[PDB]
Symmetry: C3
Subunit: 390 residues, 3 copies
Amino acid sequence: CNKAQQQGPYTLVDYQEKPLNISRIQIKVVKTSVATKGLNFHIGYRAVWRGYCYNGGSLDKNTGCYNDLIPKSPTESELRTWSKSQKCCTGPDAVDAWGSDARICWAEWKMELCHTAKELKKYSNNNHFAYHTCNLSWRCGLKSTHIEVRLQASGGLVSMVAVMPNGTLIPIEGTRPTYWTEDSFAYLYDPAGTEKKTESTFLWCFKEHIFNYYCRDNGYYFELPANRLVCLPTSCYKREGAIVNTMHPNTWKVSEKLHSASQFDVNNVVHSLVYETEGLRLALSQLDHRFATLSRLFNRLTQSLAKIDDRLLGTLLGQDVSSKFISPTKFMLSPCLSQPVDLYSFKELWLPQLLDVNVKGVVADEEGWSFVAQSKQALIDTMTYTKNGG
Amino acid sequence: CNKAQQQGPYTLVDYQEKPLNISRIQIKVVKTSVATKGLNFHIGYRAVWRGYCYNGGSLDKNTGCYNDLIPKSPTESELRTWSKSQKCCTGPDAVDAWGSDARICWAEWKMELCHTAKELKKYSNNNHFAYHTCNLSWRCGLKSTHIEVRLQASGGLVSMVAVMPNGTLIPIEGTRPTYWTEDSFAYLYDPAGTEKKTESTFLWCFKEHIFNYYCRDNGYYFELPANRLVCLPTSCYKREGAIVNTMHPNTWKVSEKLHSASQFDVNNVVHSLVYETEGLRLALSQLDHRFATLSRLFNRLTQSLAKIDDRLLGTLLGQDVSSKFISPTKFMLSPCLSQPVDLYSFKELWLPQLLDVNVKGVVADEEGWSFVAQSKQALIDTMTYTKNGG
Amino acid sequence: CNKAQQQGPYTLVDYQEKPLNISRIQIKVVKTSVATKGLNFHIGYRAVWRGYCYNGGSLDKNTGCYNDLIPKSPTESELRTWSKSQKCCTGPDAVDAWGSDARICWAEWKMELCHTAKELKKYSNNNHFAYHTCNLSWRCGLKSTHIEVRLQASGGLVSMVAVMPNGTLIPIEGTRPTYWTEDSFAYLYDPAGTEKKTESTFLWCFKEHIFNYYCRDNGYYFELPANRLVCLPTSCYKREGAIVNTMHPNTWKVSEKLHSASQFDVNNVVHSLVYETEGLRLALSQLDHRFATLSRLFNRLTQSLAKIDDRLLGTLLGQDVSSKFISPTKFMLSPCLSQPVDLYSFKELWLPQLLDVNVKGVVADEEGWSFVAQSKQALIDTMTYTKNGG
Ligand SMILES: *[C@@H]1O[C@H](CO)[C@@H](O)[C@H](O)[C@H]1NC(C)=O
Ligand SMILES: *[C@@H]1O[C@H](CO)[C@@H](O)[C@H](O)[C@H]1NC(C)=O
Ligand SMILES: *[C@@H]1O[C@H](CO)[C@@H](O)[C@H](O)[C@H]1NC(C)=O
Ligand SMILES: *[C@@H]1O[C@H](CO)[C@@H](O)[C@H](O)[C@H]1NC(C)=O
Ligand SMILES: *[C@@H]1O[C@H](CO)[C@@H](O)[C@H](O)[C@H]1NC(C)=O
Ligand SMILES: *[C@@H]1O[C@H](CO)[C@@H](O)[C@H](O)[C@H]1NC(C)=O
């Protein structure tokens, strides 16, 4: 039929997407690393319960008890000797030692007797009239374990520290063993089996103009800005040939290594994952619908060109075949038998990789600090009430 | 060659994808917010170790020691004065005060002497015959910090509460400072610098029929059902013009803010992320293969139409050029020089945004409650054994 | 115009993507499950503070105090009776019972008096000359709660255990109640309401050659290797008809259920999510650009074929219409009115599902173990100093 009507004029419009300047580059970096191996941390503790009484009667002003929990933390020498001996050495215990024996409370003891384990007893009595009564009860303990040295930059210089449960960073060197002491405890770290590198290498990062840079290393994921040193517990990163601002760096917060994450935080991460995957379902389904549309259009146009070129559908199927259309849509089939040019510019589609992610927990749950807290709790448990050993 | 054979009849089928009624809408919401700023929480503690003895001999029934750890929590006035003074004020200490001086144990003390810090000593002795012996040792401490007010709805009314480590929700008002006391401790919060909003705004949510609604705000991600108030620690959300069911709301579980997440929980979230990314790799690779197929088909069909229209490949390349096919596939090139209609209905592809996610930790690790726990632990540490100060 | 120049020869190249042997299969598995329901765990504790003194003067060697905190954990019978009674039963308390009454310190008490709650007092005095002074103060407590039985395989045999805060796995059977005791505490679990299944079923997993297998169940996500039993807290999985290596299995680490995740771990998971979503933005945007390209090419080619077939654009639009091109691009419109063959091989696009993920926290925050720790802390709080009750 058709008309002399010419209700136009029309012109096909191309689909134009909103551009995105995102791309996956290699970024050259100076990377300062640190790794530790083997039993490199040794913790010892030792203390004496000394209860020294005198019984001169209610009338004597010297009657009474002077007690004390004397801390006797081991020396570096003694802590090493314990470390190879697997025993903590100690002085003598004394129960109900009165009169001349009570002087054992004031002798400079030799730490002779060594133990697999030793807890003290809160002994005290004063029932020997006109005499002194001495009670002496020792406790000691030792654990050898593996500590993880971490990094920190202050003044622009990356140095090694050991984080303690209360947040104090213990400066650590890499040649000589570091040894320190708090009250009853003595700690010894030896830098053997520990390595601190500085390395010219590369990182696979996503550059995306708001440019931001989203980078990955081993199990760490982090933004890597320009002219700023990015420090994470065991690795710092700098852009090669870029000038770090001396201080004001991007460094890990020690608090986040001491403090645990709540169940609400992780559930919130799960919910964010759900929201994200909803977005991904939307986008992927939209692309799916697009391929449906292109399928329809390409089919109609294939019908149009095919009625002219009967060898078209054949090469389309890879089958040696010619067609004859008995219908606008239905057709029948019969058989019988340089430079490249790319019209599409399709590039390699980046498939997301499986993410190695580090989960290490809080510092208080490290074996050594757990041992320290356990020791303190045992001391509290055993000082609950005085025991009469006479 | 070809045959009179007509092994058909065939008909091209269009690709039909499984539909998905997912879409990203703006949802109008009434949102109740709350924000806090500055040092708004003040914690003080104060107590007296009073050891009051009398020495009348083994025969006197009055001989012995009455000791007590009297809690003396500061008043709101005294806590404010400490807050501006940066010192905790206290009464007098007394070591080995016997006879007439021992009466200091029973005088109504004036809290005169103020401290940067103060811990008591467990002094006790009774060696003054026919006399009383008084020992008095004070302890006090103060910390000014920043607390985060949270929201809770019971009876349909959204109100402000302060969560304590044991789970108790302290009702908080926004005009007058709230002050309370537990044993030795006194806490003072002032509502200045704190703001509670109610706001008509919008949220970007994913609506997807099983309709569910997956919503995001600041660092919070949450389902927003119909006719139900959704409360999260610092923000509640309601559908505008919808009738909340008075109670039975969707509110955050206080437990999940007090209790930490295990390493197994987070590792499990990581594994779920891995499973998810495997699905995404599958889908994206499938789409990739689809573009390969369309590339092949479009190339063959382009060859078919090009042998008829020699200006086709030119406009395909944007190059001014005509072709001549010396082969079914090989060809040669030479140069020389309204309403819109959209066949594709391609819409803007939603690219997933980078997710702002809140990670705040457990309540016990808040600075103030950490200070309280530290104070209690110090008190335990110093009450381990009696010290004779005579 | 055009030339006798034939600057070729060219040939269209098809887009070839890098293949990926990833696919979503059903894996047949033998799955050992375990579920618990109702109040199935009962915790009781009970202890006696016994301070037994004698006052014979400074001269008598028998003068002094023998004190003790005697643990008296309930029996299985008594713990069950408490469980149904909601009261913990106890012996008699005694304050300042001297002379003949002091013998109550050494009578075999009958646990007659029962309590909603009971804490002891550290009473001690010795002011009755030539007499004994007895102080007796009891404490008891009971909590009924819900414990979650977990699985563990050693020797290839999957068995049920109850994890305790210090990491010890308590072997649990499914018929008779299990009962054990530590110092002051007694615990009773009854296996009623608890179920341990072994089941032939299937899992939806992603098989992807490096083949690895990434699987999901309820809220658990885990790799399921070949010929290895994969144990998770409440469910183990084995490939059907495959031979598990007797031991050396892939089992959950008990530590990760006792130890919490740091805020740095979760923030790191967030950053990994950001990196991932950057990759997804890149890929999705690339596919978008691809559809733009195909839109352009298909439009030009549609113009080429349309000037020959004026019914083409009509069937392309589903509109009954014929075209006439007054321009290389502009055109005008007028109206008036078997086996299937698939050229594309497009398959069902897998849309990622919303991930159910379990977040359970640490074992120490379970209600029962929280109750135990609270009880111990109360005992510590009340033993701080002796109180004279005379
Ligand atoms: C895209 O990125 C390049 C660097 O690769 C930059 O030169 C250009 O300005 C950017 N353009 C836009 C629009 O982001
Ligand atoms: C942390 O502990 C160390 C060692 O006992 C001590 O020197 C330091 O002052 C403590 N710091 C804090 C903030 O508690
Ligand atoms: C799709 O969503 C619309 C609302 O946008 C609703 O009216 C319709 O029933 C839905 N259809 C299906 C099949 O989900
Ligand atoms: C929490 O502590 C407050 C203040 O000491 C107290 O009033 C309340 O009873 C406690 N609640 C619980 C469940 O421990
Ligand atoms: C692809 O997977 C099949 C099993 O489905 C396997 O037989 C084949 O070797 C694999 N090929 C490649 C290249 O991965
Ligand atoms: C854990 O506690 C149980 C019960 O008190 C005890 O038998 C076991 O030895 C403890 N194990 C460790 C490693 O502390």
